[PDB]
From a paper:
We previously reported structures of ELIC in MSP1E3D1 nanodiscs with 2:1:1 lipid in the absence and presence of agonist which are resting and agonist-bound non-conducting conformations, respectively, as well as a structure of a non-desensitizing mutant, ELIC5 (P254G/C300S/V261Y/G319F/I320F), which is a putative open-channel conformation. The pore-lining residues of the transmembrane helix M2, 16′ (F247) and 9′ (L240), in apo-MSP1E3D1ELIC and apo-spMSP1D1ELIC form hydrophobic constrictions consistent with a resting non-conducting conformation, while the MSP1E3D1ELIC5 and spNW15ELIC5 pores are open.
Activation and opening of the channel involves a tilting of the top of M2 away from the pore axis and partial loss of the helix, such that 16′ and 9′ turn away from the pore. In the extracellular domain (ECD), ELIC activation is characterized by a counter-clockwise rotation of the ECD relative to the TMD.
Author numbering:
A (entry chain C), B (entry chain D), C (entry chain E), D (entry chain A), E (entry chain B): 11 to 320
Write the structure that this text describes.
């Protein structure tokens, strides 16, 4: 095996698409190994630009191709460079722009915490012929920044592991484990936009539907509330435009369902007050005092989940 | 004919688009055959990376190109590798990322069960010159997982068949049958999102329109119901954003049409109660008792289909 | 001139986009001609795969490039093959996936009948140097199937014609006519989706607005109708999401305009009934009997067009 | 300088996107010049197909590359051909499919008149080394046709000019002027779709809001009008889906603002009638006679602009 | 080090997408350096077109590749040219079309002022082997123009700096600083479209909700206002279609929240007037005089921010 030392410099992270849980990473990858000594023009290292490395690979140079495991599509490699030293070490530098994908858990949607994962692996050479010594990730450009709505908290975590592939076991008897490099970058979602953009209008709608119980007109108790019901019902697919069609429920959908329950319970409660109007003149005060208990009890509904969920 | 043994390793399945019934498959394909013995450096097998296989094909090596039949666009082949053995066998390993298409039947839309199909076939060599011995599909990464909203149930089914092509009969007299490999992966749709996102709000709207019959105001019987009618009418094209413009009707559209029938029948029933108001003071109770029968009978409508359909 | 015999096998037709009147065709194209006899390894025909045909073209082989005239973008050629025979005939087989475009007439939109047209033509060689003997279209995979919402009725029609190009007349004096091959595949749109998805809800809305004339409350005559007016007005741009911004009107837009006329005429009729209320107590029955004539006469409006249009 | 004679044949014009003011042009470009006499096989001209011209350029042939100035992205050149004559003249024929961009003035949006502009220019050779003798544009396929919603009126105008580039002045002292070819194709927008799709529904809404002044119920004067106000307000961003976010106002937006002014003036007028109800029983007729003047005066508003604008 | 003189000519700037803060730049880049003297055909400089420069790079010519740092994806280089002089200087001219990205601050959204930034840098050669002498930016085509909705004010600013890269420090001991060129083009957003398209309709809605306090009907005080509330609530996500999901609030969102506060305060104020109706006949005038103070005080709310923000 030959040891390869990697250095990944993340230029920027952009285009975090939560619909299909893919993000876009731009950066540079440096892979340095050692070989037989060679002669170079002068004592300076020889620099081979793009569309000239293939001329050296044709002549017999050994340049492994390191692929990205969790990519979507293909990584768009731009300029690439090969630095050959007189002492006999080779440096393969390249620029990559890849749409990577990682599994995300959007339970706590407004207050989420995810991680962007970069997986690097040789395509053909296993650990018997290629090993990863170490990786230093230089996340200086996005160390503590906000990209679109995600804060990058802390540094990046690096891991070197061995992955056993069983589909190559029929062609390689006992050498089918490949060295894999994992780079994890923690990100925390910014809840401010949803706080002033959906939390406040939904809370205002819910408070307006709370304040409909004080009216002395029955038709205006029912029509305005119903309206508010129908608007909150129309607010159902807000999360499905941002995220995907998730099986679980998020905080925003939980408060939407809570608004459904509260407003429909108010509708059924005033209809049950009309049920209790046997003579049509009877007025309720103990069950219509919900004017005071309705808002508080609903408030409790959300906080309970809030605590249980975080 | 020369026998080719295939091994397809599905890295991940993502991007299941039901509008045009295409999904995206990432993975590795290994095709192993045997030939004349050759000399290699040392006793180890010789590994030929990408943009170096063509140099061997130019010199006279026999590397068939296996295409994907049911692809949309072209498969995006990334890194590719050729392993030549001293005993005289050749292994062609490649990474494919293809947008494949399969026919889907969205009758039971929330509780669907489809299959993802991968079809592999030589482009030029028929079964007289190329045969598929066996395929082992290594679906270990997606064995029992949820990808976006589809559960992968069970293992993958493999089939090797012969497809007779009639367009090559005018150029090949009696050898126009090609060996085809089919990989079927069963998937079951997760009904949870539609259960809490569309089933519950539509049921709440329908129950609210059921509870409008108890009012003692005629204008408020009609205006609120009509509203609920117009919202359920506005809920018509929900399925056409997820799936295509299907000729048949799904469960969601069936309950939407059932809501149309129930709510419009309530509208026509209260209008017919006003028809029976010859003196304008007559009140109905046998036909206005639908307050009790209306909800139940409607409930029956859906269950009947539910049973007949599953 | 040298005669070229073509065989086009349509693998599948998908992605029929009516916004820009383009569809996507996948298939195989076989072009067979004859030349000088040559020597091949053994007596079997020699098969030349992709990225190896150019080596033969460099050495002096004559392989014409047949382009697609009505394509949008460029056809995505995948694998390609060249079969050379010892008797001296050449077969050029290729796989094409092209976004083709044809003019469509969406007058009868729900009950349309279009045709998918494939035009094939040599790029450089005219009929003095290249002629098309015959084309057999093998439409076996889509013979009688439904693709997305189009039924393929009957077989495919083939035509071989000569197209005179005037832009090459300044460089070629009397030889500027190119042989063109046209393949026409008839398709009929399935009206079922629009029948249960837009025909029925619009008919229900129109019937509900018909049934508003029986009310004994004037404000509830006007507000509900107006609403129904405003919803039918909001249903104007349904056709523009499916098709383009057509200059003519389709069946769906014709019934939308008919709903405009009927509902606005009902609005103006009840307002004119209020006009006739000089003392405010006068009630009309001859012009308010429209309760019976209104629905029928409107029904007549559509059928008349229906017959005139089909 | 060497004179180059151009012939541009427009196959079709499609995909006119007014959001970013780009259209798509498919066609053929022929560039003919003369050089030293050469020997060809026989007396017929020699035809060099695609991926074979570069072999002649390597050997020393002079083939200039003519770029398109106003393109978006890069032009997708398909098949290309080089015709070499025994008398010593070279013809470069190519097929281009380019997304071109031109500045458009959407003041009169429904009744617009734009022009599609194709700009062709040598990339490197100035007028001291390359001149354009003449261009004949063969717009026979789209001479008098409708493409999507644009009529092509008249023929195409051709112009040959010299463009002085100042960024090449630091590297070329007195030779930095390049020969440019401009092709202008006049197009007139079809106003029919907007006439039956937005002009008529907006006019119907405005007429319905005109006819609300005849009611003898004050609450029904206000609620229905307000509704109509809110719908016309919701019709604000119709132009921004077709065109971009223009700084000026179009005819459709001008009539939308006119509907705002008319309907809000009716709202403020009936509220001012309630202002004049000091005793609550006073009824106005001179200022409430707007029933007659309101519709006419509004009609005048639009026509005035109509005339001033065209 | 060898000095390289750059000249960037911006052909056009288009496609300013504020959702992901990327724009598209088309233009030409000229890089001129000097080397050893060489012999050319005649005394004229030798011009090497595209797909011929690589033949010179193979033979030993030194052509550095200058990349764009802030690009998204990869720059689409079209035609490229190499001008070699007899005195021994090399000019590399190229055409670039790149999707560049810059950080934007959408606080003052309708009255914004941003800058488009182009960053150019050698891929491999540091300042010890490649230096940038000067750059002249020829922004003559977009000097004082409006592109889509942005005015280009003033000229372009050029800067040459040194960027220290730490990821190359492990492979280069003390030479890891690269010469970088920054081009800044100031742009000012045109507020006219938002002035006539969203400022005026929102102001009209707010004024209509101001004018609801003058009614002598309580149900019509509440229902119309509520409606206006619900429409202004529905106007929440207007900014999120133009820009992204920003954490801060813009002017349009600030006035939307101000409309929320004003209209909901009017709703709570008329409900509190009903609270003060202990006998149900009491009418307020000091707190219901808001008819005069309500509009003015709200007006003040916006202006205060306006001044504090600009």
């Amino acid at each position: 095996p030959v040891d390869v030392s990697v250095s990944i410099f993340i230029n920027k992270i952009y285009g975090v698409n939560t619909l299909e849980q893919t993000y876009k990473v731009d950066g540079y990858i440096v892979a340095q190994w050692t070989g037989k000594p060679r002669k170079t023009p002068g004592d300076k290292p020889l620099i081979v630009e793009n569309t000239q490395i293939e001329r050296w690979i044709n002549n017999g140079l050994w340049v492994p191709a390191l692929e990205f495991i969790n990519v979507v599509g293909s990584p768009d490699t731009g300029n690439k460079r090969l630095m050959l030293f007189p002492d006999g070490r080779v440096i393969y530098n390249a620029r990559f722009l890849g749409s990577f994908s990682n599994d995300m858990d959007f339970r706590l949607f407004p207050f989420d915490r995810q991680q962007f994962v970069l997986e690097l692996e040789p395509f053909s050479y296993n650990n018997q012929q290629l090993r990863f010594s170490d990786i230093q990730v230089y996340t200086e450009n996005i160390d503590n920044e906000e990209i679109d709505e995600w804060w990058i908290r802390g540094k990046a975590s690096t891991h070197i592991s061995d992955i056993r592939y069983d589909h190559l076991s029929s062609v390689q008897p006992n050498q089918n484990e490949f060295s894999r490099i994992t780079v994890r970058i923690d990100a925390v979602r910014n809840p401010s936009y949803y706080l002033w953009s959906f939390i406040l209008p939904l809370g205002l709608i819910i408070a307006a539907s709370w304040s409909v119980f004080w009216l002395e007109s029955f038709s205006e108790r029912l029509q305005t509330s119903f309206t508010l019901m129908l608007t909150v019902v129309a607010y159902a697919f807000y999360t499905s435009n941002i995220l995907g069609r998730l099986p679980y429920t998020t905080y925003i959908d939980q408060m939407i369902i809570a608004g459904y329950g509260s407003i429909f319970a108010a509708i059924l409660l005033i209809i049950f007050a009309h049920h209790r109007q046997a003579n049509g003149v009877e007025d309720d005060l103990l069950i219509q005092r919900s004017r005071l208990a309705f808002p508080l009890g609903f408030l409790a509904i959300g906080c309970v989940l809030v605590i249980r969920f975080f």
